[PDB]
Scaffold this active site. Structure first.
Site, PDB file in Angstrom:
ATOM      1  N   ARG A  48       1.551  41.388  27.240  1.00  0.00           N
ATOM      2  CA  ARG A  48       1.475  40.030  26.700  1.00  0.00           C
ATOM      3  C   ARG A  48       1.153  39.075  27.839  1.00  0.00           C
ATOM      4  O   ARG A  48       2.057  38.538  28.484  1.00  0.00           O
ATOM      5  CB  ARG A  48       2.801  39.657  26.023  1.00  0.00           C
ATOM      6  CG  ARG A  48       2.790  38.394  25.162  1.00  0.00           C
ATOM      7  CD  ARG A  48       4.077  38.342  24.337  1.00  0.00           C
ATOM      8  NE  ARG A  48       4.105  37.289  23.314  1.00  0.00           N
ATOM      9  CZ  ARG A  48       4.542  36.038  23.489  1.00  0.00           C
ATOM     10  NH1 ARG A  48       4.990  35.615  24.666  1.00  0.00           N
ATOM     11  NH2 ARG A  48       4.522  35.189  22.472  1.00  0.00           N
TER      12      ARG A  48
ATOM     13  N   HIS B 160      16.803  44.732  22.914  1.00  0.00           N
ATOM     14  CA  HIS B 160      16.989  44.095  24.204  1.00  0.00           C
ATOM     15  C   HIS B 160      17.246  42.609  24.036  1.00  0.00           C
ATOM     16  O   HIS B 160      17.076  42.077  22.924  1.00  0.00           O
ATOM     17  CB  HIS B 160      15.708  44.206  25.038  1.00  0.00           C
ATOM     18  CG  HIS B 160      15.334  45.594  25.393  1.00  0.00           C
ATOM     19  ND1 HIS B 160      16.270  46.513  25.818  1.00  0.00           N
ATOM     20  CD2 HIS B 160      14.127  46.199  25.501  1.00  0.00           C
ATOM     21  CE1 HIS B 160      15.653  47.646  26.130  1.00  0.00           C
ATOM     22  NE2 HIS B 160      14.356  47.474  25.951  1.00  0.00           N
TER      23      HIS B 160
ATOM     24  N   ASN C  98       5.918  48.097  23.667  1.00  0.00           N
ATOM     25  CA  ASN C  98       6.499  46.921  23.066  1.00  0.00           C
ATOM     26  C   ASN C  98       5.590  46.288  22.038  1.00  0.00           C
ATOM     27  O   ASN C  98       4.359  46.391  22.176  1.00  0.00           O
ATOM     28  CB  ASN C  98       6.835  45.879  24.168  1.00  0.00           C
ATOM     29  CG  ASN C  98       8.224  46.088  24.748  1.00  0.00           C
ATOM     30  OD1 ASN C  98       8.484  46.031  25.979  1.00  0.00           O
ATOM     31  ND2 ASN C  98       9.142  46.335  23.854  1.00  0.00           N
TER      32      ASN C  98
ATOM     33  N   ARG D 209       2.764  36.281  20.073  1.00  0.00           N
ATOM     34  CA  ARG D 209       3.537  37.461  19.690  1.00  0.00           C
ATOM     35  C   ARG D 209       2.744  38.266  18.677  1.00  0.00           C
ATOM     36  O   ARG D 209       2.620  39.487  18.789  1.00  0.00           O
ATOM     37  CB  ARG D 209       4.855  37.019  19.065  1.00  0.00           C
ATOM     38  CG  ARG D 209       5.804  38.143  18.695  1.00  0.00           C
ATOM     39  CD  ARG D 209       6.212  38.925  19.927  1.00  0.00           C
ATOM     40  NE  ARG D 209       7.616  39.308  19.869  1.00  0.00           N
ATOM     41  CZ  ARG D 209       8.278  39.907  20.858  1.00  0.00           C
ATOM     42  NH1 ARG D 209       7.669  40.216  22.011  1.00  0.00           N
ATOM     43  NH2 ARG D 209       9.568  40.203  20.686  1.00  0.00           N
TER      44      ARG D 209
ATOM     45  N   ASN E 271      -1.339  45.911  19.899  1.00  0.00           N
ATOM     46  CA  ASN E 271      -0.596  47.117  20.148  1.00  0.00           C
ATOM     47  C   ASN E 271      -0.378  47.867  18.850  1.00  0.00           C
ATOM     48  O   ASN E 271      -0.272  49.044  18.903  1.00  0.00           O
ATOM     49  CB  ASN E 271       0.722  46.828  20.897  1.00  0.00           C
ATOM     50  CG  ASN E 271       0.528  46.675  22.409  1.00  0.00           C
ATOM     51  OD1 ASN E 271      -0.571  46.878  22.912  1.00  0.00           O
ATOM     52  ND2 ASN E 271       1.599  46.315  23.137  1.00  0.00           N
TER      53      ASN E 271
ATOM     54  N   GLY F 190      -0.700  57.125  27.497  1.00  0.00           N
ATOM     55  CA  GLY F 190      -0.599  55.980  28.408  1.00  0.00           C
ATOM     56  C   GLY F 190      -0.233  56.517  29.777  1.00  0.00           C
ATOM     57  O   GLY F 190       0.814  57.201  29.968  1.00  0.00           O
TER      58      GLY F 190
ATOM     59  N   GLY G  24      -0.242  54.472  32.676  1.00  0.00           N
ATOM     60  CA  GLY G  24       0.008  53.336  33.491  1.00  0.00           C
ATOM     61  C   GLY G  24       1.287  53.440  34.270  1.00  0.00           C
ATOM     62  O   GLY G  24       1.646  54.531  34.802  1.00  0.00           O
TER      63      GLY G  24
END
Ligand SMILES: NC(=O)c1ccc[n+]([C@@H]2O[C@H](COP(=O)([O-])OP(=O)(O)OC[C@H]3O[C@@H](n4cnc5c(N)ncnc54)[C@H](O)[C@@H]3O)[C@@H](O)[C@H]2O)c1
Ligand SMILES: NC(=O)c1ccc[n+]([C@@H]2O[C@H](COP(=O)([O-])OP(=O)(O)OC[C@H]3O[C@@H](n4cnc5c(N)ncnc54)[C@H](O)[C@@H]3O)[C@@H](O)[C@H]2O)c1
Ligand SMILES: NC(=O)c1ccc[n+]([C@@H]2O[C@H](COP(=O)([O-])OP(=O)(O)OC[C@H]3O[C@@H](n4cnc5c(N)ncnc54)[C@H](O)[C@@H]3O)[C@@H](O)[C@H]2O)c1
Ligand SMILES: NC(=O)c1ccc[n+]([C@@H]2O[C@H](COP(=O)([O-])OP(=O)(O)OC[C@H]3O[C@@H](n4cnc5c(N)ncnc54)[C@H](O)[C@@H]3O)[C@@H](O)[C@H]2O)c1
Ligand SMILES: [Ca+2]
Ligand SMILES: [Ca+2]
Ligand SMILES: [Ca+2]
Ligand SMILES: [Ca+2]
Ligand SMILES: [Ca+2]
Ligand SMILES: [Ca+2]
Ligand SMILES: [Ca+2]
Ligand SMILES: [Ca+2]
Ligand SMILES: [Cl-]
Ligand SMILES: [Cl-]
Ligand SMILES: [Cl-]
Ligand SMILES: [Cl-]
Lengths: 315, 315, 315, 315
Positions: free
Chosen positions: C82, C175, C120, C88, C95, C9, C11
């Site tokens: 998302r 989190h 995530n 979800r 993912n 990744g 990004g």
């Protein structure tokens, strides 16, 4: 599996090497000396400093060579100073004996190490240490030129009023009368010093005086300190070489390196620019000399030859 | 009384500038943008990163220029990209208007700042920003040459298989066709590239291709990313300039600087090597050109003149 | 033989990881993405920045997993956001598919890597990535707690007007509502926050608000940026974990780690303090909870269980 | 306008302070000593090292106090060692005389400096130096507690097998029998040492032995070195204090600070945690003691009182 750095000699330079290796997070450090207590104390003092900057490194001191086992880098400062009542031969005799012991210890315990010799007289001690240890010639080097480069860079940066980061000094050979500066390959921001004189950024006289000051630089520190020689710049210089090895940086640094024909020389350690990476001395940069430089370099090599002959005479 | 750095524009380069200023512990940072939320979010994100490395710096975001009050350094990236359907004049028209607003904000709130312009087209935007802000010409510079130097150094270091630390690139002028490389004042360890070709360390063709690759370097990144232009090297380059100011390092760096007669030029911003210290642009290093270089430099300055004339035409 | 870091990744977080790995001289970097051009461009941009700070590191971009061969560390950010119209389950579905591909690539090409998952929803993605890759559970971890710790430390340091260096935050779990803060094991200079309230250095209300602000911290950045989520603090946090592995620092960091009975949990990834060294997750520090904490932790684990069940439901 | 650091005493600690100030790019450095040549030589050696790491700093040595004019920070190590045939009174007599001269020099030449005293016996010398110099009490501090903290952190990190970065040590008072450790406010990752014993991460006996080892830590180094006392950790500790001032970091560090009623004490320098920023000692963190701690602290203060009375007796 952190890198392991063994420092053979835990005196002025060796302590400073140990401190820098911590600050730079280069790896674990073993300080070795024949004076028991000294390497253990400096090791523990530096270890105790570590939580202040947050470097994680193991520190230990030793007087048995088993302690250096598996060292990735070995930096040698072990030896004695030339006290006012001592001959050159005396000094060589003594410090050759030290190199014998150090070489045996490296041979047995750290045969895969990159070895950086600092002990004087350097061009002979590095040659002797390679012979005594039997390590590959590309894995044994001497620190000298980086120090000269660093001193000259400091003087230049002061002269031009510019950052030390934008000055380059090109030096070959040894210290003092054996140094071979190329001011034309020394630069500020890429502009050679010889061109900076033409631009009026300095003068020929000032340039010559900075070259001479570099030749005399070690003695200038001795004359100020009186009790010993320089240690901060010598240690920084060798750490740069060590870091280039450990991090495979392929820095191009003037070091005493074994020549296999480069510069017309076979079988001697001579100060030349070398690329230092994970395989040791990986390439020698052989520049093309003008006449003045050829003659300066020839004198410098003859000086090395004479010292090697003195070694053989005393051993 | 930490130094205060204001970043006018909180986009790709501006965020990266902000991150670097933290990591390098250069001081407090204010991110400014017209898009509300963006500078506040990036500021807070970087602030929240700080405990991981241990840098103490205040971060804030704003869209009112009062937030930049008393900035020691201001780095300007504010502006818009040249979308495929936009003329050069369109872009200049737009980004000149941005410079007008930014110059007014600096004039009122940070008149004592060292200002580093990044917004394109750089040689015109820096000229315009100095005029709009009224700041002393030695306190307003443009970043361009450092980036070209950095790209060329990367290509050289890859070519020679040596550390980036031992390569120097000498570039003047602007980017692309306006770049004025001096390969003879570009070096590995002090040895000029022209001499490295003679030594066979590279070839003339490879050297020429690296020069061309540097000319095209910005576009090469655009062509890879597709959505935007380079930002990591641009930001690093400007931070070097900022650090030289803040720490009075007197680095010698190629930057777009206001010439008061140097290089034969009066009243224009042109890429030249300058010493950056606590008084801003403290000296310009004016080298002596060969014929090929004089002609390349003359084209490059004419290019700057034509863009300044386009500015006046659009404003 | 420099360390090799593969970033799966390229990004927002992945570029930032790449930049930090350079600045910190952690080793060579490979950026991987399915969007061709992106990893190559960011790699080249960072590479071109390197001569400014003097870091020697190879950078490359790729879209074939062979490029990651022999990576010492792999940090995974690959995946999709998302979008407002996505469930979800949709997100997990998507993912999870990404983790499948990434796990296969690591399995084949970097089986000896320390893997740090960021994608995530983290506590499920890290669990899935370990299962897909087959790597040892002690060699796969998720970044989450370090970020929460960093945010809370920033808020505390601002509240007390002290250095971020002297604040410690103790957080377990995930989190948001799944975070399990222990303010009694959070400190300024060793003094717990609960005692600082008694000293009047802050108030209970302010402390509670800082805890809540940490719970909401990710969303707070999203709400400011609007186009994406946080990236500077997330990247810094994961680099701390990587550095602890690469330099065998044995940092104690809250991370999503596979529990083999610690905290009463078997077979799940849960945020807990772990010692990270050259063997991966080397030990879990299992603290003794009070009642409020036990119940908070139980909710947090149930949350993880529910997400793992959703994964199995969608795969 | 770089910051200026004056180092009064250019011996073991003073050289090390000078080296660290360079490496950390804290500013210009003046080394002062009564032994002519020593500060000049060490200054020049460090200056000559600078081009190796790229730090730009002016270095100079002096034996006239005019050289320290306008210093931002002054760090005092000047004095003599307690030779085996010397009384405590002898030492105080001698080093009080040194503080008299140093205080006069600071008064005249650097009245706006933040002064950090290191010379022993510290709690008396710092008190004397403040009185002699007349500087504001918040601008004169003594280094002691940071060193004790650093030693204890090293021992803890070794015991738990964790990074030095995640250990906190809380110490007040002086060294040796005058140290007041709070193991309950000492932590690994926020978990107090007293709780780590309950978890079985260590034992009470091992904890007590580490506390005792910290009490004895200075002597442990003396006993190893034989020729002198510790210098690497002492210097690192004082540089942390200096950096907090110069960069306005607001670190919370245990230092000998002038108490205006905090901890129940008025008119004495006592080791306590203080916030150090650009205004000097900005706040004292006064913790709440348990009975054992109150009694330990009372002994420690009485010890300070007895030494201050000895000063008055000898001056
Ligand atoms: N190459 C250069 O450019 C350069 C520059 C400066 C100094 N030097 C040389 O570096 C060397 C070290 O200088 P220094 O200031 O650290 O010296 P120093 O006297 O402080 O340290 C030398 C250490 O070697 C130890 N030692 C002696 N015999 C030994 C043995 N047989 N085995 C192990 N250890 C032994 C001593 O006990 C001492 O601690 C000297 O020879 C000096 O001339 C070289
Ligand atoms: N000088 C060079 O060598 C060099 C190299 C690369 C990029 N650039 C130039 O740097 C500039 C910035 O590039 P980037 O990638 O960060 O762009 P970006 O589009 O990501 O960022 C520009 C920021 O400026 C903001 N902005 C727009 N109008 C503004 C105004 N009136 N006031 C304040 N802020 C405003 C935008 O909202 C945006 O956040 C561009 O012009 C680019 O061409 C220069
Ligand atoms: N764990 C945490 O504490 C935390 C905090 C912040 C963000 N995140 C998460 O981190 C992840 C990355 O965030 P970001 O801002 O970098 O996202 P981003 O969208 O900028 O980057 C994701 C990258 O993954 C790439 N990608 C998509 N599918 C892929 C595939 N099959 N293989 C390889 N690459 C692929 C995309 O092309 C993109 O470049 C997100 O899932 C985000 O929610 C986690
Ligand atoms: N506070 C602590 O935690 C701590 C820890 C370690 C050492 N110390 C103390 O630090 C001090 C310095 O230790 P060191 O190892 O650097 O000592 P050192 O003997 O190497 O250096 C002291 C320097 O002060 C110089 N000096 C003597 N009289 C002077 C005067 N009148 N003016 C200026 N300079 C003078 C000496 O010439 C010498 O160079 C000692 O008193 C030592 O006990 C304190
Ligand atoms: Ca660190
Ligand atoms: Ca040849
Ligand atoms: Ca720090
Ligand atoms: Ca001229
Ligand atoms: Ca470097
Ligand atoms: Ca248990
Ligand atoms: Ca630098
Ligand atoms: Ca009180
Ligand atoms: Cl500390
Ligand atoms: Cl952390
Ligand atoms: Cl540069
Ligand atoms: Cl160098």
């Amino acid at each position: 599996a952190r890198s392991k750095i063994a420092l053979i000699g835990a005196g002025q330079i060796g302590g400073t090497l140990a401190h820098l290796a911590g600050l730079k997070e280069l790896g674990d450090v073993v300080l070795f000396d024949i004076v028991d207590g000294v390497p253990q104390g400096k090791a523990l003092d530096i270890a105790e400093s570590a939580p202040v900057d947050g470097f994680d490194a193991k520190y230990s001191g030793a007087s048995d060579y088993s302690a250096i086992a598996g060292a990735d880098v070995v930096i040698v400062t072990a030896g004695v100073p030339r006290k006012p009542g001592m001959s050159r031969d005396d000094l060589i005799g003594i410090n050759l004996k030290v190199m014998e012991a150090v070489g045996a210890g490296i041979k047995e315990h750290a045969p895969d190490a990159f070895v950086i010799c600092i002990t004087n007289p350097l061009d002979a001690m590095v040659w002797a240490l390679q012979k005594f240890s039997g390590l590959p010639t590309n894995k044994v080097v001497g620190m000298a030129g980086v120090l000269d480069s660093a001193r000259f860079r400091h003087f230049l940066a002061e002269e031009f009023g510019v950052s030390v980061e934008d000055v380059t000094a090109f030096v070959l050979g040894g210290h003092g009368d054996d140094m071979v500066p190329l001011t034309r390959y020394s630069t500020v921001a890429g502009v050679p010093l010889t061109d900076l004189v033409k631009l009026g950024w300095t003068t020929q006289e000032k340039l010559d005086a900075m070259v001479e000051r570099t030749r005399k630089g070690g003695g200038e520190i001795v004359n100020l300190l009186k009790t010993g020689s320089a240690f901060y710049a010598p240690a920084a210089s060798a750490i740069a070489m060590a870091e280039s090895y450990l991090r495979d940086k392929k820095r191009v640094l003037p070091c005493a390196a074994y020549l296999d024909g480069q510069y017309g020389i076979d079988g001697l350690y001579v100060g030349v620019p070398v690329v230092i990476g994970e395989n040791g001395v990986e390439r020698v940069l052989e520049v093309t000399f003008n006449d003045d430089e050829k003659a300066m370099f020839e004198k410098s090599v003859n000086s090395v030859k004479g010292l090697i002959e003195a070694c053989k005479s005393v051993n």
